[PDB]
Amino acid sequence: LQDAEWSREEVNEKLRDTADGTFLVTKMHGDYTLTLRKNKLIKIKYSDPLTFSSVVELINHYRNESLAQYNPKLDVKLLYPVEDNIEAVGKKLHEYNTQFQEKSREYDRLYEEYTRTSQEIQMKRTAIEAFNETIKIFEEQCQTQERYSKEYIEKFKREGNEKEIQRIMHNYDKLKSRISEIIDSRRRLEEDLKKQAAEYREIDKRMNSIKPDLIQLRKTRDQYLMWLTQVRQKKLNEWL
Amino acid sequence: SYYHHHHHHDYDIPTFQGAMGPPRPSSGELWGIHLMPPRILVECLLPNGMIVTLECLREATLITIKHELFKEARKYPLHQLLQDESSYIFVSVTQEAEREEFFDETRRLCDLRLFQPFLKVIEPVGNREEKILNREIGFAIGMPVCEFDMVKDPEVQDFRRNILNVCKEAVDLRDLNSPHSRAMYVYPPNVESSPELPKHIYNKLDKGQIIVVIWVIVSPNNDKQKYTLKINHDCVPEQVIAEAIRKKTRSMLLSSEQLKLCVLEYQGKYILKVCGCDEYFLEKYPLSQYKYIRSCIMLGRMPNLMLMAKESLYSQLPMDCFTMPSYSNGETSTKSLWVINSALRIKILCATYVNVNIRDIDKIYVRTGIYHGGEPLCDNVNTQRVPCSNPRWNEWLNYDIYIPDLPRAARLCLSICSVEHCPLAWGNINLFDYTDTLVSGKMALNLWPVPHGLEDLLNPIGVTGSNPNKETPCLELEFDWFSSVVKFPDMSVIEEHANWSVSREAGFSYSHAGLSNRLARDRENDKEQLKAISTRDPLSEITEQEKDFLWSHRHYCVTIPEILPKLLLSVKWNSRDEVAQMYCLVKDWPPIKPEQAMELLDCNYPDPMVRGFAVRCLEKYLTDDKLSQYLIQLVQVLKYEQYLDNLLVRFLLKKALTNQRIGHFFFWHLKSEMHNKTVSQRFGLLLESYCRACGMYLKHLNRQVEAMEKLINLTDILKQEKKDETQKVQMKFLVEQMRRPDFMDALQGFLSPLNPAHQLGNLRLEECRIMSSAKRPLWLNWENPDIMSELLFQNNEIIFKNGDDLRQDMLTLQIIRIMENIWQNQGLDLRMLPYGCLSIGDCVGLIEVVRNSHTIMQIQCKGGLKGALQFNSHTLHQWLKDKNKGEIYDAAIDLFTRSCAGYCVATFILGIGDRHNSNIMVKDDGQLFHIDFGHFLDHKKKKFGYKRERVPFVLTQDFLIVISKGAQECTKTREFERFQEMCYKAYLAIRQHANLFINLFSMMLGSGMPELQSFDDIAYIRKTLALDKTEQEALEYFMKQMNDAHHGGWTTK
Ligand SMILES: O=c1[nH]c(=O)c2nccnc2[nH]1
Ligand SMILES: Cc1cccc(N)n1
């Protein structure tokens, strides 16, 4: 009954990320607390149907049966009841815990690169819009002059013809070759946008390969640290 | 034999930011460059079609440029086609990608944010130039106002138009008793919550009197005159103004009666200022109740007020001049949700942009669930189909819940996952829209990545809505269509079904009335068990017995209003019968204390009726003092609201527009988070409303906003091109840059964002400098330009630190500030120094400089003997004696011993970063205070952890010696018997307010702070406080905890 295996906080950090059905079990308040994860906490002859003579008697019955008949909306069973070298298991703890911490920083580093790359990408996209709008104004400007310039020719012509129209054409040439530079400058961003968008995907990719390792590396490290604590609370920190 | 000759073949030192240990980046004054070149060529597009290219100086004003452009246009062809310069304005494409027209021609080329350096000339279109000063609003906000106008969403566009309701209401309150209420907005009374004085403050008064000093100015306005009153602590400003005038105008040429007549005329023309800062005493409160006085009592100072003519104050104020903006249903009696006779089924269709190693992962699927904070049905997945490659499930998922049983605030939470269980992306959608309309059709949900702390499978705490980031996993899907827009019940309809469910409840067999969720009692022992439940904190999670027990008794639970949080979490929200009943309780439930009611705006209470009642609580009880204490948490809690338009948003917006001291921190807390796409939309629209309605403060904020941007840019360069240069080189660049006219303009005449009470005048650049830290903070210093600078502080100085996420500090400092007020207003003087801290962006902020304070390291470096052997345990004590001598010493040690006790408890409770000689600080007067807290709730327990329950402030010999007035075996004195008793009385005090501290931390989960990802993070503070235990056990627990970290001392009470 004591070896049946059965505060609030550490119960949740062992019920953390377990499946739908996993369980475990002020005295002037109540005696024993069943913590079924669907976290549903259930108090505990051991409410009305009291004929179950033990803390192990009451839990076996609901391993087979669901909890819908007892309290209406709990249609879920108690389905999952979740090296002899004491030093060498403790050495392995440090090893896996170094491997966990070491694997975490690689995950944490990437999360920043992801988030910078999100910002740098969208900063490029906004610049593109800006370039596009910039160009629209110069495309409008090379248009705007064609109205007033070639109107001036027809007003007079003879009056300093190539003397005037060269210095109007010179301006018009500087206007268009500047447009050519901007468009070239826009393209050169867009190519880098995809080079960014490529790298961005590769960070996402590597995060998702690092994650399941990170969880299983953590999950092992818990059960390794559980098996040890079955006291020596303060020796753990040197390894850890 | 060191390494068994084991080579690491991967390793290579060339090619990490571990070496020299940041957050970035941004573009500054032009595209892709931080600061524009000092002389620059700018292409000027004329209306005649000619590009004339001026070399302008970086700093040149648009008037200066226009004037030169039209000089240089005469030399180019088609000049006869140009108007006068006066009939033109500038325009160009900005870094935000908009084509901003440049009206304020006093602005400088560098401050325009120009993208490419070019300027087009135009005759000013849109003849209401007044209306196109929304750039002001857009500059204040950080995104241009036009960026909302081209948003499709009706919610967003409805929020914009609807929320103007609130804006109009508040401007009416302001111009009510003008000019008085206009001054009352701008300069509200900075006033402690209670008039009642704590005993220890009182006893510094001799039976409740203070010596004041009223100042006056007469001719021309140079010489001033002291008028040193000695008035009762609880007499009001108007009485203090009389007595000053009395003495001012007593004479040998004025009889007794003649004085009283000359008092009455003179009396009402003046009001009380604080000498040295823009604070004022504009209403009937006790003098003691104003913060400035109560400080002057505690610090042993003589208040320096000033008599100020009301017409010189109402001279300095402007007109509020609000304007309504340029932006100025239902199909049928549509099919009510309670008719829709079906289960829930949602069609998953396809994810597109999923980034996975086919080599690493076997299979991927979509997880799903319905939620209300906690979940109303059995969770499910779809089958592990088309894994990796293309992910394409054309399944209808089947949820056991009837469609009438969905609560108003129901939400789908989904997550693509890997198999070995492990999430890839996540996203959540509200099953109803803002118009109450059940979601039917096809949605395009773009997803978020899994954060650090959440290793969990699904993430229901996460934000509702799609990701704005396009190139991410877009999992589209389909909802069931029911031949009509399906709308949620009226309250008229919910009430009736409640009155039915209760009238029905009265008539079942008692044979049946034993199903463990229905009451017939109409017992003495039970009623004690219920208030027992009531007293417990939010995180003592409730059992199914207690839930049903509460839910059955729900009508008796009205007697104990404070139970409500526990009751609400006991309702089964999947049972419309229950929910409709609960709706009727909350409709007329006795309003409650804000500290308890704020729980109801956290993520475990997402219903609109509940949250309404909670706002109702704040409208009654929460005062403008208590609001600005908790503002951070209330701005945070907006994130858990389903829709843009809601009661809380309208409550806060009004208060902000009613009180310009709330208004100020309300702006900066929102503006802070504007980088974050989770809230860019929401907080932009909200900040648009504030900025449109807040009066002339918009111009004051724009100057603060312009200053912070200058310093962001400056540090950004220091941290990138000028890394790997000596301080000497760096400073010579910082001094060079801050002397430029654009910097002098931008950084001199404005208000401290840390506290807009203080102005900031000219920059003393000789005291301006970069600190040692590799984050490259600036130590900035300003001339306090007040009339009475000298009476408060001639120099103002604050630290600007581009590089660290201030908002942990910000919160721990907040938490300390609250613990202090709890201790002190409950009669026991410990003295914490919660210095000021303000996050104003992405790891950018401001920290108050406490002058005359030093790291213990400095104490020991200065007072450390030469020929470096060892620092002395006494050289703190010797350094502190060297400052405080006489009866002054005895009181300095009291301060150290009173601060050091409080800082032990808070630190131990909050579990903050390990304290050591370079982050502990002692002041000349002898007070001890901590700085740079790092991670709060024991966040380096993510690595290992597990029942660490750390003591971070461990009183070394250094501190012990000073507490025990220089003795040996400090452990064994009365000096230390006192200290211990302070630490016990402090600890126990916080423990009886532990609901609050949990609750505050609960409301902070919204912020993307690594240290607060989920409620068990918060749960550290339960263990630390021993809330599961009885308080004598808690006491002995604390002793035990403090004794082991110290090794001997603590074992008698
Ligand atoms: O359906 C939505 N589409 C959106 O783009 C959006 N954005 C922010 C918040 N809710 C949203 N809801
Ligand atoms: C032509 C166009 C459309 C939408 C946005 C902007 N900036 N410009």
Ligand SMILES: Cc1cccc(N)n1
């Ligand atoms: C872990 C959990 C489950 C259900 C509700 C809450 N508040 N927390």
